[model samples]
Target: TFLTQVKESLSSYWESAKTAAQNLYEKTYLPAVDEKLRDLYSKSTAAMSTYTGIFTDQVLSVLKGEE
Candidate 1:
């Protein structure tokens, strides 16, 4: 049962990895080539904050399960 859960969770993580790569291309790498670095930096910082919030929330939820 634990192995099954780990496999399913790893699959979900891989799906997010694909989306993250696409997001980097769409937001940072591609735009940085054409746009100002300052603009890209500002947008990326905001996006990273949102991602941080999401990750923090997810981890907290998992920790709560341990309790």
Candidate 2:
């Protein structure tokens, strides 16, 4: 349930980031400062970090028990 919610949230944020980046690309030749894009990017990155940490910890815990 928690992972599902995280995935859904990540997807929503990814969509937002895509749209914002597309809009910014069309308007400006250079990568301009886009708040939505920046926010979405930051959040998705953080989510990945959290997911990695959790997954790694789980694996390590299981491996330790095997020893």
Candidate 3:
């Protein structure tokens, strides 16, 4: 009986710990990572647009009169 009680107690503690860890990660870690990814995406999109514009302008300049 003592051993069985100890096993059940350990099991409950383990489950509670896992749940707390998951909640912390979901509430804190996941949001932080999501924000950073959004920031990275915005910067990457802006950089790509700038490079595309520069390339297009150069091509148009050559086609028009090499100016």
Candidate 4:
């Protein structure tokens, strides 16, 4: 009987723990990660555009004998 009582208590606690974890991830952690990823993506895209423009300008100047 004591063993059964202990098992029941553990089972209940496990369910509550699982629910809390899922709630934390869904409500807090997931959104924060998503926002961070979006910010990183935007910065990367702008950097790529700037570098590409600079490279193109350098190539054109060399071809025109200006550089």
lDDT of each: 0.67, 0.67, 0.68, 0.68
The whole-model C-alpha lDDT of candidate 1 against the native structure comes to: 0.67
- Could you give me the TM-score of model 2 versus the true structure? 0.25
lDDT of 2 by residue, 2-34 (tens): 989998898988988887887867634455645
- For model 3, the superposed segments whose C-alpha errors exceed 4 Å read 1-9, 27-67
Worst 10 residues of 2 by lDDT: 27-36
Instruction: Tell me the spans in candidate 4 whose CA falls farther than 4 Å from its real position.
Output: 1-47
The stretch of ten residues in a row with the least summed lDDT in candidate 3 is 33-42
Which residue window of length 10 is worst by lDDT in model 4?
Answer: 33-42
Q: Which TM-score value belongs to model 1? A: 0.26
lDDT of 4 by residue, 4-49 (tens): 9998898988977886886686835575644356456547666544
CA RMSD, predictions in order? 9.1, 12.1, 21.5, 21.2
Clashes of each: 0, 0, 0, 0
RMSD of 3: 21.5
| Candidate order, TM-score descending | 4, 1, 2, 3
- Comparison by TM-score, 3 against 4, better one: 4
